Structure formats: structure tokens, C-alpha cells
Amino acid sequence: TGLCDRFRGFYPVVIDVETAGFNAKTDALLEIAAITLKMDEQGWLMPDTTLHFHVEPFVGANLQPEALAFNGIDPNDPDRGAVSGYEALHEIFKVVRKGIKASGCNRAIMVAHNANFDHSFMMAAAERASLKRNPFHPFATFDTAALAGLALGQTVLSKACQTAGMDFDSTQAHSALYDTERTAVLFCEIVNRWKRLGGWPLSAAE
Amino acid sequence: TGLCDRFRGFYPVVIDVETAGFNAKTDALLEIAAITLKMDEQGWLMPDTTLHFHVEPFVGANLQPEALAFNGIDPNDPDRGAVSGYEALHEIFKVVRKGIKASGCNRAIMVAHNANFDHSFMMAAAERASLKRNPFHPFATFDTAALAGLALGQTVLSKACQTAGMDFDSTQAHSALYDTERTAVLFCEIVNRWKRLGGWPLSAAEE
Numbered sequence: 160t161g162l163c164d165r166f167r168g169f170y171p172v173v174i175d176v177e178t179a180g181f182n183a184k185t186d187a188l189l190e191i192a193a194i195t196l197k198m199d200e201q202g203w204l205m206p207d208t209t210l211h212f213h214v215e216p217f218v219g220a221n222l223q224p225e226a227l228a229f230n231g232i233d234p235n236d237p238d239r240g241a242v243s244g245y246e247a248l249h250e251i252f253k254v255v256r257k258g259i260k261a262s263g264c265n266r267a268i269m270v271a272h273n274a275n276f277d278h279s280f281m282m283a284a285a286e287r288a289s290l291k292r293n294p295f296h297p298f299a300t301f302d303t304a305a306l307a308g309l310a311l312g313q314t315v316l317s318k319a320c321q322t323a324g325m326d327f328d329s330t331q332a333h334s335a336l337y338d339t340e341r342t343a344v345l346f347c348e349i350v351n352r353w354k355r356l357g358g359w360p361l362s363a364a365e
Numbered sequence: 366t367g368l369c370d371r372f373r374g375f376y377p378v379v380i381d382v383e384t385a386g387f388n389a390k391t392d393a394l395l396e397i398a399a400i401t402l403k404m405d406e407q408g409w410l411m412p413d414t415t416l417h418f419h420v421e422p423f424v425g426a427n428l429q430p431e432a433l434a435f436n437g438i439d440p441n442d443p444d445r446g447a448v449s450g451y452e453a454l455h456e457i458f459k460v461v462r463k464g465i466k467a468s469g470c471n472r473a474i475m476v477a478h479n480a481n482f483d484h485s486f487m488m489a490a491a492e493r494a495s496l497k498r499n500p501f502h503p504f505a506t507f508d509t510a511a512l513a514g515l516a517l518g519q520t521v522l523s524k525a526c527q528t529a530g531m532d533f534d535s536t537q538a539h540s541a542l543y544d545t546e547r548t549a550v551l552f553c554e555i556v557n558r559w560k561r562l563g564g565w566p567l568s569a570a571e572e
């Protein structure tokens with residue numbers, strides 16, 4: 160019933176980013192949020208710690224007009240309270256390492272909707288900042304689009320949440336924090352439903 | 366109980382590649398296999414068509430020594446029955462479009478273990494070949510590592526298959542065809558087990 164027992168020692172951390180384009184190498188990271196998870200004594204999964212940041216475009220970054228028009232972000236607005244990617248990621252890694260230790264896990268794994276995209280941007284931001292001992296697995300992820308495809312027959316975030324009986328407010332859809340929170344509740348509902356129906360533990364079916 | 370109903374019209378196709386390195390843009394594709402899926406009238410999921418190819422390294426391709434040592438592949442061996450990437454993918458795409466049409470789906474979705482890797486490579490190969498109307502979704506995948514994590518609490522292919530009660534022969538682990546077939550069976554047993562436990566369809570829980 161321990162978190163470290165559930166995914167062979169992977170510590171699931173839910174992540175969402177907003178960006179200034181599709182290229183993780185060249186395009187700015189603009190927002191990032193992170194939610195760690197915990198299991199209670201009965202082995203039920205729920206959100207734990209929540210972090211969120213507006214991120215300043217890195218020096219030399221590209222910004223796609225079409226991307227800014229899509230997500231509504233204006234990185235030039237001095238009232239957005241941006242911090243550096245270094246500051247944002249450094250804080251996330253600190254919280255994540257602490258969770259990993261506390262829970263007895265060995266490595267963090269990113270949980271995200273269409274996880275490749277977010278993984279790519281987070282890793283590149285990590286590399287730009289020269290952060291040491293990145294707690295996240297360098298290529299494994301838990302894509303909630305695929306998990307929802309299985310659990311709920313839906314692959315789009317908003318539709319998956321709806322099918323799962325969750326609220327989803329589209330006016331908040333371009334916010335990394337909102338998306339991260341909805342995805343965390345979504346992931347937990349999928350893991351918990353699996354357990355509740357007798358799919359886990361593997362011994363439970365008998 | 367229709368395949369097209371199961372994943373909002375995504376036609377799932379299991380894929381595995383073997384490569385001459387980690388870079389999808391610059392490293393050679395060396396093997397690729399593909400297995401389409403079908404559902405019976407009761408809604409159970411199983412393999413349909415199987416394809417497999419040894420792939421000739423594309424002109425200008427990089428080949429990492431460490432990658433060849435890892436997977437045991439020697440691209441210079443004239444007995445390996447290699448075909449061009451164009452030929453391999455053209456034939457896979459043809460089988461896939463036919464399945465999509467036959468089943469009434471709208472697009473194919475790649476099923477693979479650590480699917481981003483395979484997706485990157487397949488997309489790059491399609492692009493090198495100038496293939497039109499790629500049946501596959503440009504970024505969505507069904508990663509079986511993540512699905513196995515949920516279903517079986519395991520993320521490594523061989524361990525996942527074992528936990529699922531499947532055989533897994535490590536001497537065949539570097540073969541795209543073998544990996545694809547194991548991954549197809551794994552995916553199907555995960556989908557089928559969810560249905561049989563009463564997790565699908567969504568209305569089953571109250572009947």
C-alpha cells in the first residue's frame with residue numbers, strides 16, 4: 160500500500176508547461192507547474208505538494224507569435240511575476256528530491272498529458288540551467304492521454320476529465336497550474352478506480 | 366464493441382524499431398515491425414496483421430558503434446534481407462490505411478513501449494521517404510510502459526510481460542518483430558483485463 164511499491168520505486172510527479180512554441184530546444188518555457196502525489200495508509204493516491212511559476216523567457220529564446228496568441232501569455236508584461244527557469248526548476252527539484260527520500264522511492268517520473276512535449280521542455284530547461292542530479296527519469300513518462308485512452312476511452316484532456324466526472328473549465332485551459340491540477344486529479348482517479356475495481360494489487364482478484 | 370468506438374476513432378498499431386543510435390534525425394533506422402489490431406464481435410482486442418522489415422541505413426545516416434554492439438545488428442551483412450526505409454514504411458502505411466478504412470476509424474495511433482522513441486524514428490523515416498498522407502497521428506501515442514505501470518506496476522517490457530504471465534525470451538530482445546509481438550500481446554491483455562474486470566465499457570460497473 161506504499162507509494163514506492165506501486166510503480167517499482169518511481170515517484171510520480173505531475174507536470175504541465177506552457178511555451179512560446181513547439182520546439183523544446185529553441186522556444187521559451189513560459190509557465191510550469193508541478194504536483195507531487197502521496198498514498199494514504201490504505202494505498203489510495205492523492206495530490207500532495209503543489210508548485211507553480213511564471214517563467215521568464217531564457218536569454219536567446221525564440222517566441223512564436225502564433226504560440227503567444229494561442230495561450231494568451233505576454234512575457235513582456237511586468238506584472239506577470241516571472242522567475243528564471245533556474246529558480247523554478249531548482250525549487251521543483253528540491254521538493255521532488257525531498258518527496259522521493261520521504262517515500263523511499265529511487266527516481267521521479269513525469270506524469271503529464273501528452274507527456275513527451277512537457278518532458279522535452281522540462282529537460283531542456285534543466286539543461287539550460289545546468290542543474291545537477293535531476294531527480295526525473297531521463298526518458299520514461301506516464302502519459303495521461305494514453306492512460307485515459309485505456310481507462311476512459313478518451314485522449315483529450317478536457318473530454319477525459321468530463322468522462323471521468325470531473326469539472327473542466329475551458330477559460331483556464333491555457334494555465335499550467337490549472338492543467339496540472341486537473342491532470343493530477345485525473346491520474347489519481349484512474350489509478351484509484353483501477354484499485355477499487357480489483358485490478359490492483361495483483362493478488363486482489365482472487 | 367467496435368474497434369473504432371474503443372479509442373474515439375484511433376486505429377491502434379503496435380510498432381517497434383531498432384536503430385543505430387538515440388538520435389531520430391541523424392541515426393539509421395535498422396529494423397521496424399508493425400502489428401495492427403482487431404476486435405471480435407464481443408469486443409475483445411487481438412492482433413490482426415503483422416509486418417516486419419530489416420531496414421537499409423539511409424544515405425548519410427550516422428551509425429553509433431555502441432548501438433550496434435548493443436543490438437547485435439551488422440548493417441553491412443548482405444544476407445540480412447534489408448529493404449529501403451521507403452519500402453518498409455510504404456508497405457506499413459498501406460496496410461494501416463486499409464485497416465482504418467475497413468474498421469471506420471479516422472487515424473492510426475502508435476502503440477509502443479516507451480513510445481516517444483519509436484514515434485520519433487518512424488516519423489523521421491516517413492519524412493526521409495517523402496511519404497504522403499501519413500496515417501499516424503503526428504504526436505499522440507499509446508506508451509505501453511505507462512500502461513503497464515498502471516495495469517501491472519511495471520515499466521520494463523520484459524518484466525511487464527512476465528508479471529502479466531507472458532513468456533519473454535531475452536535472446537530475442539533486440540528483434541523488432543519479437544518486441545512488437547510481445548508488446549501487442551501485452552497491450553491486448555491490458556485492454557482486455559480492464560474490460561473483463563468491469564472497467565469497460567463505462568456502464569458495466571452498474572450492471
Ligand SMILES: [Co+2]
Pocket residue numbers: 188214215216217243244245284287
Ligand atoms: Co528556461
Ligand SMILES: [Co+2]
Pocket residue numbers: 394420421422423449450451490493
Ligand atoms: Co530510413
Ligand SMILES: [Mg+2]
Pocket residue numbers: 175176272338
Ligand atoms: Mg499541456
Ligand SMILES: [Mg+2]
Pocket residue numbers: 381382478544
Ligand atoms: Mg523498443
